[PDB]
Write a protein that binds this ligand. Structure first.
Ligand SMILES: CCCCCCCCCCCCCCCCCC(=O)OC[C@H](COP(=O)(O)OCCN)OC(=O)CCCCCCCCCCCCCCCCC
Ligand SMILES: CCCCCCCCCCCCCCCCCC(=O)OC[C@H](COP(=O)(O)OCCN)OC(=O)CCCCCCCCCCCCCCCCC
Ligand SMILES: CCCCCCCCCCCCCCCCCC(=O)OC[C@H](COP(=O)(O)OCCN)OC(=O)CCCCCCCCCCCCCCCCC
Ligand SMILES: CCCCCCCCCCCCCCCCCC(=O)OC[C@H](COP(=O)(O)OCCN)OC(=O)CCCCCCCCCCCCCCCCC
Ligand SMILES: CC(C)CCC[C@@H](C)[C@H]1CC[C@H]2[C@@H]3CC=C4C[C@@H](O)CC[C@]4(C)[C@H]3CC[C@]12C
Ligand SMILES: CC(C)CCC[C@@H](C)[C@H]1CC[C@H]2[C@@H]3CC=C4C[C@@H](O)CC[C@]4(C)[C@H]3CC[C@]12C
Ligand SMILES: CC(C)CCC[C@@H](C)[C@H]1CC[C@H]2[C@@H]3CC=C4C[C@@H](O)CC[C@]4(C)[C@H]3CC[C@]12C
Ligand SMILES: CC(C)CCC[C@@H](C)[C@H]1CC[C@H]2[C@@H]3CC=C4C[C@@H](O)CC[C@]4(C)[C@H]3CC[C@]12C
Ligand SMILES: CC(C)CCC[C@@H](C)[C@H]1CC[C@H]2[C@@H]3CC=C4C[C@@H](O)CC[C@]4(C)[C@H]3CC[C@]12C
Ligand SMILES: CC(C)CCC[C@@H](C)[C@H]1CC[C@H]2[C@@H]3CC=C4C[C@@H](O)CC[C@]4(C)[C@H]3CC[C@]12C
Ligand SMILES: CC(C)CCC[C@@H](C)[C@H]1CC[C@H]2[C@@H]3CC=C4C[C@@H](O)CC[C@]4(C)[C@H]3CC[C@]12C
Ligand SMILES: CC(C)CCC[C@@H](C)[C@H]1CC[C@H]2[C@@H]3CC=C4C[C@@H](O)CC[C@]4(C)[C@H]3CC[C@]12C
Ligand SMILES: CCCCCCCCCCCCCC
Ligand SMILES: CCCCCCCCCCCCCC
Ligand SMILES: CCCCCCCCCCCCCC
Ligand SMILES: CCCCCCCCCCCCCC
Ligand SMILES: CCCCCCCCCCCCCC
Ligand SMILES: CCCCCCCCCCCCCC
Ligand SMILES: O=C(O)CCC(=O)C(=O)O
Ligand SMILES: O=C(O)CCC(=O)C(=O)O
Ligand code: NA
Ligand code: NA
Lengths: 513, 513
């Protein structure tokens, strides 16, 4: 029956067009079953979810679907849905991306990575720790994909230098290779959750909060950092121990140290541009953290309340990158008339920034925000909350555990951003129905959607690591089961112990009722 | 006194930083003179105008200044100013840019250009006409910069083929060269005004109308086209006659025909992707035109009023480019099990679109819209209208003439988009003060800001043409004086004769009072 296999291959080869054409027909009964506006909004949301999961269209292109569907269906006029795509959360994201582009332009990230690798050591467990701490720190500010793609060649070079009764020794070599190659994407995913700009789903949560709960303002850069950074550190430590036990065995060292010092020296001396970019990045982080950390007064109290935000601070800081000189200025240049008068190069030109900023992710976040606005305005949120009646008796902690497990095992097959975009309105409505703080369910879902460790399709970093060829699918699956379990447990601990104090989750807020 | 010249050169070399640092100090008295909110808004507007004119910052970076300045100054909170950057006008612009990227990806624009050049002829006056008609048609959908940059090499090749008592013949050769090289940017600038998506200032007018006059909806793709296309044709004819008289003398022909047929044949046969892109472009134009042309009922009357717009149609049409196959589909492929199962290439991937869309111009338009919103909300518009009291006795036609002349002679030194962004609120307030329709002053300013012909700095197409080296500054100045005069006269004629019927300019609208 080779004809069946041939037909299956033909169907799989044209899977994108088939899914694209047949998803609206399959979702058509949703419109008929539900009330008109809510049914049409749910149809749009489900269509976009299926398109994102199956990759029938580019993620940015699928994110543009509200623009078409909401006005034709009467859910939302164009002049309303279109500006949801540049809410201030997207400007915070854009400022973070511009700062990351400036950092990568001058190889500051590589210098920091190599310095940390020098500091931690060369011993095998110490080396997996070094790699994990480097990737998690660089994923806090750069994207997970960029951090993984930059750190993988360094790991490959170090492993080649290290490895440049035979069955035993070869087994240990291969296990060390697999451990090094699997510790990078996991640490990138873990570290992306520590900051709002670290990964897109955090900004999805921030932007969709404005639509579902416009009066909520307790989630900002400082509060999210003080909540997630200890959780990120605990999860990174647990993952490092798990990987070192599983794979790491918990003159080669000299060779690895030599290759690390080669790659650090190849960067040359620290340029003035690198120092300026680092100082601007430190100012960026400090001013984002200290604007309104909610436990001590911030510098936003010196201005009009309700006017400033993290986006304004980010844009103001990244504006300096476009005019600050990349060469060391000197007052003698004015006095010396014989010096050349070539115009100085700024720290970042707009050409490089534009060619390095992922505008697709910006449009994806905008599509998520517009879908949240359409769900709120069409009344689909009220209908969803009405449908969540049988779950109103679930204990809140058990509810957190179940939603975290469901989102973690659903993000293993789809993009984290799309997963959180689809699942966040459900979490908000469930929290409203459960007489509990909306953040108490929304934050764990946002954090857990980034807990994608089992499959190459789960996150782009996983695919980049799998492209190396030293990792099997079974290896990532068996590591990711326990990674997901530890992440779920630690997320529940964080949500029940110190998120309560940070976000005032103990009482139902006035803006949620 | 060579020290003075040396110091002047030092100052000019560091002009960007000097302007950037000293403009706020020079504009500081504006805050003190005016009332607080209006003074701060005017300070922001003047700072952005100076930065745009002097190029102290990249245009997109300067467009981000409202994000910083309005919240710190209390003019507008971040959650309000940031979404002004993705009003639906920017999505119409983005759809136009994506369609232009799809057109340029498959060399459809080059095929159309070469076909038109074949059709018009090879005779010198006929050849300047051909060039002008090609560049003006391609500037209607592509950007002026892109059209000029694509059409200049073709003109260079044709001139080289043509030229590949000696003083007389050399004079005629040089004049023909100058005429061909000057007819391209002028025609690109003229043709950019025919459509809303042809050039950014039209979209600036459309977006700022939403802020100044939210209830105005008579300006759309169809109405703007039926207003500007006859005006564009008349101005193109006048410019062609002027250039042919000034420079064109109003076996070389065989050689030029041979090189044109070489460059047409080098494109190969018409691909299926080219045909699909052309059909999608025709659908794009027709559906934009027929949505609500205001003289015959459109297809928007079949849906909810006030929900659809040109942006929705544009996004819906350009969405097809991202999944429609670039190769001819066949039903035999399913039946033939031995055919390869390689996935088909879409007409446009998001990678190419992202690397070809000018996101800087999108951010510039957004900055213009945000500045318009800040001017309206801060009360600066009311103050400006109060300051325009002595001009209330000027006849409306004379007012149109004066504003067109002022804007035309001001855009000769700065970007058209920045010029229209700065001048449009003044035009709206002057129209309000003058008891006349706001469009009667706003449209001529928007059209005339694109009438930049005298200097290389006026428009990027002028700079690209000047980079060839065959054009002198005096040549462009002497051509552009009469080009500007004819443009002003034709714009006044259009505003006083047939714009009145198209836009109902004869009476003060209810949404303006
Ligand atoms: C790998 C390929 C792609 C795979 C798919 C990826 C995307 C899909 C993700 C999972 C599926 C989505 C959720 C389940 C299907 C959609 C929900 C549904 O069936 O809604 C309609 C249904 C009608 O119920 P009704 O008859 O109204 O109940 C009696 C009272 N009227 O309503 C109900 O049954 C009531 C309960 C509704 C619960 C919430 C439904 C919406 C959840 C998502 C919101 C966003
Ligand atoms: C906001 C205030 C202003 C900014 C912060 C204060 C000023 C910091 C100094 C200016 C910048 C110096 C350049 C930093 C480059 C990136 C870090 C790096 O890789 O530095 C390595 C270098 C030491 O090694 P090196 O000398 O390069 O090589 C030979 C070693 N035997 O390192 C050095 O030489 C100096 C290392 C400095 C380490 C700084 C640690 C963090 C300081 C607080 C950050 C707060 C925000 C965090 C987010
Ligand atoms: C090449 C390098 C760059 C060159 C510069 C490029 C950008 C600048 C473009 C031209 C200059 C801008 C317009 C003129 C300067 C700004 C206007 C001004 O001076 O405003 C303050 C002034 C105060 O008038 P006041 O004392 O209030 O009058 C008595 C009643 N109170 O107000 C008045 O005098 C009253 C009349 C105001 C008329 C409109 C002013 C605003 C026009 C632009 C709005 C946008
Ligand atoms: C919305 C309805 C669907 C779309 C419009 C109707 C279908 C049009 C046909 C499908 C597309 C065909 C390919 C067009 C490519 C771009 C034009 C071009 O350069 O065509 C050249 C070609 C003739 O020359 P060729 O055969 O290539 O070379 C040897 C000549 N001896 O030309 C040809 O072979 C055909 C030329 C067709 C000319 C069409 C003119 C405009 C039609 C109305 C457009 C309305 C919207 C305008 C905006
Ligand atoms: C697109 C894929 C992956 C998901 C499944 C989509 C389709 C098959 C699903 C989604 C929602 C479903 C509908 C949900 C509710 C009802 C109401 C009742 O009359 C039972 C059938 C009916 C009408 C379902 C029919 C099947 C349905 C339309
Ligand atoms: C500018 C940064 C990067 C480096 C300089 C030092 C930092 C730590 C300084 C600069 C400005 C300072 C703020 C200025 C004003 C206030 C308001 C006051 O009621 C509480 C302290 C607070 C909020 C300060 C905190 C510390 C602060 C943020
Ligand atoms: C702050 C106010 C008062 C004065 C500003 C002076 C600025 C414009 C001056 C001071 C020092 C100068 C720099 C000194 C040296 C060089 C190296 C050479 O390649 C020329 C450009 C460059 C990079 C100069 C650019 C202009 C510069 C930055
Ligand atoms: C990696 C593992 C071992 C660490 C996390 C352990 C988990 C299962 C533990 C640690 C902290 C615990 C929570 C601490 C406090 C409360 C509040 C109480 O009123 C109900 C139980 C609840 C909600 C606990 C649920 C279980 C919990 C989340
Ligand atoms: C930046 C360059 C190109 C344009 C000129 C900017 C400066 C020099 C201009 C712009 C607006 C001007 C002010 C406009 C109005 C007044 C009120 C009155 O008291 C006269 C002086 C004063 C206070 C002017 C001082 C000079 C001023 C601040
Ligand atoms: C789809 C396009 C590109 C090609 C097909 C032909 C075009 C010209 C057709 C397709 C749909 C048509 C529209 C369908 C419905 C209406 C409403 C009616 O009250 C007036 C005519 C009007 C507004 C039609 C005008 C012509 C139209 C736009
Ligand atoms: C409309 C519904 C019912 C059926 C859709 C069938 C689609 C998916 C089929 C029909 C024709 C097919 C194409 C036929 C031939 C080729 C050339 C070869 O390189 C394989 C891919 C490609 C480009 C196929 C892609 C898939 C395709 C477009
Ligand atoms: C290239 C040149 C020759 C063509 C344009 C000529 C200009 C100067 C002419 C042609 C049409 C004319 C307008 C036609 C109608 C009116 C309405 C009338 O109540 C006042 C004069 C006014 C407003 C005219 C002003 C001058 C005008 C704009
Ligand atoms: C090709 C991707 C978009 C498909 C949109 C289909 C919309 C169908 C709507 C059906 C329900 C409303 C009928 C009036
Ligand atoms: C009740 C008013 C709206 C009726 C039509 C709703 C469905 C419109 C679907 C349009 C699809 C357009 C795809 C490009
Ligand atoms: C030895 C290093 C000397 C130079 C240190 C300062 C580098 C540039 C810092 C720029 C900071 C800008 C803040 C707005
Ligand atoms: C570097 C570009 C931005 C400069 C902004 C300067 C703002 C100054 C405001 C002064 C008036 C208000 C004082 C309270
Ligand atoms: C009256 C309330 C506001 C007072 C301050 C206004 C000026 C603020 C200027 C901030 C400049 C920031 C540059 C990054
Ligand atoms: C000889 C040419 C045969 C093919 C003509 C059609 C090309 C593709 C047209 C696609 C139109 C899509 C409309 C949504
Ligand atoms: O945004 C990132 O850091 C990349 C990872 C991500 O969000 C995804 O998997 O979609
Ligand atoms: O948008 C264009 O077509 C380019 C020309 C323009 O707008 C400008 O000169 O700024
Ligand atoms: Na990251
Ligand atoms: Na154009």
């Amino acid at each position: 029956m080779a004809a069946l296999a041939a037909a299956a291959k033909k169907v799989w080869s044209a899977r994108r067009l088939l899914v694209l054409l047949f998803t609206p027909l399959a979702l058509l009964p949703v419109v008929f079953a539900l009330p008109p506006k809510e049914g049409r909004c749910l149809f749009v949301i489900l269509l976009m979810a299926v398109y994102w999961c199956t990759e029938a269209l580019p993620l940015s292109v699928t994110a543009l679907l509200p623009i078409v569907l909401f006005p034709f269906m009467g859910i939302l006029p164009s002049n309303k849905v279109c500006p949801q795509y540049f809410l201030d959360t997207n400007f915070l994201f854009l400022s973070g991306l511009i700062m990351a582009s400036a950092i990568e332009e001058w190889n500051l990230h590589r210098r920091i990575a190599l310095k940390i690798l020098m500091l931690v050591g060369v011993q095998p467990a110490r080396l997996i720790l070094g790699m994990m701490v480097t990737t998690s720190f660089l994923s806090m500010w750069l994207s997970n994909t960029a951090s993984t793609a930059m750190m993988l060649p360094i790991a490959n070079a170090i492993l080649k230098s290290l490895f440049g009764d035979s069955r035993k020794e070869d087994e240990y070599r291969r296990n060390i290779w697999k451990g090094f190659l699997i510790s990078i994407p996991y640490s990138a995913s873990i570290g992306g959750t520590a900051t709002l700009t670290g990964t897109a789903p955090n900004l999805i949560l921030l932007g969709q909060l404005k639509s579902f709960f416009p009066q909520c303002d307790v989630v900002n850069f400082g509060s999210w950092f003080i909540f997630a950074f200890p959780l990120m550190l605990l999860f990174l430590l647990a993952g490092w121990l798990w990987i070192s036990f599983l794979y790491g065995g918990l003159n080669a060292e000299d060779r690895a140290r030599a290759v690390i010092r080669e790659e650090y020296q190849n960067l040359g001396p620290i340029k003035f541009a690198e120092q300026a970019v680092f100082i601007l990045f430190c100012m960026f982080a400090i001013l984002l953290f200290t604007r309104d950390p909610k436990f001590i007064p911030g510098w936003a109290s010196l201005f009009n309340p309700g006017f400033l935000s993290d986006a304004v601070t980010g844009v103001a800081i990244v504006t300096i990158l476009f005019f600050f000189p990349s060469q060391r200025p000197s007052l003698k240049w004015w006095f010396d008339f014989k010096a050349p008068n070539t115009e100085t190069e700024p720290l970042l030109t707009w050409k490089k920034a534009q060619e390095t900023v992922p505008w697709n992710i910006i449009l994806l976040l905008g599509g998520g925000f517009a879908m949240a606005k359409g769900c709120e305005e069409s009344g689909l949120s009220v209908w969803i909350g009405g449908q969540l009646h049988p779950l109103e008796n679930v204990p809140p902690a058990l509810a957190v555990l179940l939603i975290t497990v469901v989102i973690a095992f659903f993000t293993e097959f789809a993009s984290n951003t799309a997963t959180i975009i689809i699942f966040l309105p459900v979490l908000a409505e469930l929290a409203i129905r459960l007489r509990v703080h909306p953040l108490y369910l929304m934050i764990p879902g946002t954090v857990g959607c980034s807990f994608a460790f089992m499959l190459p399709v789960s996150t782009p970093p996983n695919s980049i690591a799998f492209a190396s060829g030293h990792l099997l699918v079974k290896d990532m699956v068996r590591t990711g089961l326990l990674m997901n379990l530890m992440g779920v447990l630690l997320l529940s601990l964080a949500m029940n112990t110190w998120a309560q104090t940070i976000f005032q989750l103990g009482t139902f807020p006035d803006w949620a009722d």
